[PDB]
């Protein structure tokens, strides 16, 4: 039951540790699109910016 | 020694959800964040649009 709880306890180490590493690559895409739509986000609010900078002139 | 094992290996399944529960928020934060980039990203190219019509206006 041990050996097996040991072959659970070693799955739940590798199921986590694998779901654990899976999220870091889901965060890791996750982040990197969050990067690219924040970056597109603040080139868009710097073109806000200039606009806005273009609109008050 | 094999629950000694199972002890650490469940110790590693817990730290390793640990990590997964942990990646898993910063995930779902950074997805959140993402999905509300996304939407900035967007109202951000409509301002990029609004913007640029109040400077072609």
Redesign the interface.
Known sequence: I??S??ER??E??E???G??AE??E??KT??N??KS??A??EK??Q??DR??E??KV
Chains 1, 2 share one sequence.
Do not use: G, M
């Open positions: 041990i050996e709880d040991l306890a070693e739940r180490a199921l986590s540790e779901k654990c999220l870091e889901e965060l996750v982040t699109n969050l739509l924040e597109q986000a868009y609010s073109k806000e606009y806005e273009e609109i």
